[PDB]
Amino acid sequence: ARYLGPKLKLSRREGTDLFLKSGVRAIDTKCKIEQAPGQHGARKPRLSDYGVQLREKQKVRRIYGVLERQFRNYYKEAARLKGNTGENLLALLEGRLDNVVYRMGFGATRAEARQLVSHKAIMVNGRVVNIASYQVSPNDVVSIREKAKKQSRVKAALELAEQREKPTWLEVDAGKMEGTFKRKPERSDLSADINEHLIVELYSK
């Protein structure tokens, strides 16, 4: 149910940075970011339309840490919902609870955030929520409980987050270690490099 393998490997394969490490050390220093993964990486065959779509999909999936069945389900729900399908899908992915904690900044990576959620460190509306796929809703306060409030990892994460760029759609208090999920983020607020449209087409062939 989780990918258990090299992370910079995933990034190398995609091409982009998927943010699977904390970013203390640059990824170019941590790995050959230029060279593609494997014996035969230094070769670029020209990629078909299917291939390109697949690569982008892989990128997004790796970034968030969603396996295929779950991703497909997300897409179906997004399609069902009114409005633009790709936009909707991105919103759902952001909405995921692990992603929200990462945005707030209690986890250095999404992996870290997921671990915290799993281990029951995070309460949504004063209730320890355990599911990483838990959809957070608008106006939902989500907070670190005091036992995990003493975590040096959590405090380290906060420092890292302070370094990172803060999201407009959340509001987070570092001392209280609580953030209010004010609204589901808009596509302009999310990254432009993600071409959700390719994902939609792929799951619509």
Partner: protein, 156 residues
């Protein structure tokens, strides 16, 4: 601003006393993303040359299409040798639901929301021929008003 993309490149042969002579055919399609589309079919002994010829041909003899808000104006059929094509305007956000060649020509044209199907033969060259014919043979409400001698409000 004249975005172009090559649909299909195919190798074809002629036979001579010696043996076989191979050559390549490149089907390209260019368009400005505001209505104007033009396709070109180049032939040369090697692929890059063929592609270049196709691009030049395509760049000239393009054709303007009355597009309504990034989609078709009404359901339109198109026929040619075997490739018979149907294409229907669809609501904003559906995206282009269209085959291969068809997708290319539409995309360069600048239509963002269509439901197409290629019936009959799906020979790239013919399907492009069909699609361009279909797109051209499509008038707007301005044009119909002009023809019938009425205002657009009377027609709606």
């Amino acid at each position: 601003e004249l975005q172009e993309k090559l649909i299909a490149v195919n190798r074809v042969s002629k036979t001579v006393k010696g043996g076989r002579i191979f050559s390549f055919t490149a089907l390209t399609v260019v368009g400005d993303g505001n209505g104007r589309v033009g396709f070109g079919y180049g032939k040369a002994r090697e692929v890059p040359a063929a592609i270049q010829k196709a691009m030049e041909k395509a760049r000239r003899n393009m054709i303007n299409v009355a597009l309504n808000n990034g989609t078709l104006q009404h359901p339109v059929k198109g026929v040619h040798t075997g490739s018979r094509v149907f294409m229907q305007p669809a609501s904003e956000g559906t995206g282009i639901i269209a085959g291969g060649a068809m997708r290319a020509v539409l995309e360069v044209a600048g239509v963002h929301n269509v439901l197409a199907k290629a019936y009959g033969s799906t020979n790239p060259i013919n399907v492009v021929r069909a699609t361009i014919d279909g797109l051209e043979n499509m008038n707007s409400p301005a044009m119909v008003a002009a023809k019938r001698g009425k205002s657009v409000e009377e027609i709606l």
